[PDB]
Symmetry: C2
Subunit: 125 residues, 2 copies
């Protein structure tokens, strides 16, 4: 599964990457502070595409992507909505973690192997 | 009129441009396949939802005037009346399509002002 990618996908990835270092804040969806679905929602809204506010809702939009076909901008939903990240290439994802670390870039593999969470959806708006 | 409040489009254009670092430079280019200097700034803003002039010279008139000390990520820096254009990304750095040998890079605004022979003729906030 390698559905059609667009400028909005690569642009959402670039906006998310530029937000690295932003604070984590419960319910946040702006540069003042993001939660996990608020960062992905914000990145796509700024690229001109509205996606649902919750990780669970983000799991149903766009086209299904297979793991090996991930491209920058793909939304990775974890354990049915427990978490959401945005793929930025090189096996890395950008995501709002917790108040101690804020918005970071880290390994998809490390999170899948050690967080206790599993990828339940990979979507390409 | 002068140094007006920035928007998400400004910070978003800066993020999109920074993500294009490593892209090839190509004469007349305005896509990830290859960019010229004004093609990169136009593309970054189009992806952030704003249409700006295609040429560096036209970008000198877009949006509002900005003074050097008030630059914020997303500000367009026009050089020698359109000879070059770059986008400020903060920390004194700008992203720009240089030439085929280096492609799109991030480099110092002060290094370019002091040694390129070019001068800032306009700083604009779309």
């Amino acid at each position: 599964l390698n559905p059609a990618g667009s400028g909005s996908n690569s642009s959402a990835a670039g906006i998310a990457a530029s937000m690295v270092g932003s604070p984590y804040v419960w319910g946040g969806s702006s540069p003042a502070g993001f939660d996990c679905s608020g960062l992905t929602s914000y990145a796509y809204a700024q690229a001109g595409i509205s996606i649902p506010r919750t990780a669970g809702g983000q799991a149903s939009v766009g086209s299904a992507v297979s793991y090996g076909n991930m491209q920058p901008g793909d939304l990775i939903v974890w354990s049915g909505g427990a978490h959401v990240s945005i793929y930025v290439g090189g096996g890395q994802m950008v995501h709002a973690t917790n108040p101690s670390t804020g918005v970071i870039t880290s390994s998809v593999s490390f999170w899948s192997n050690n967080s206790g969470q599993s990828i339940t959806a990979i979507r390409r708006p």
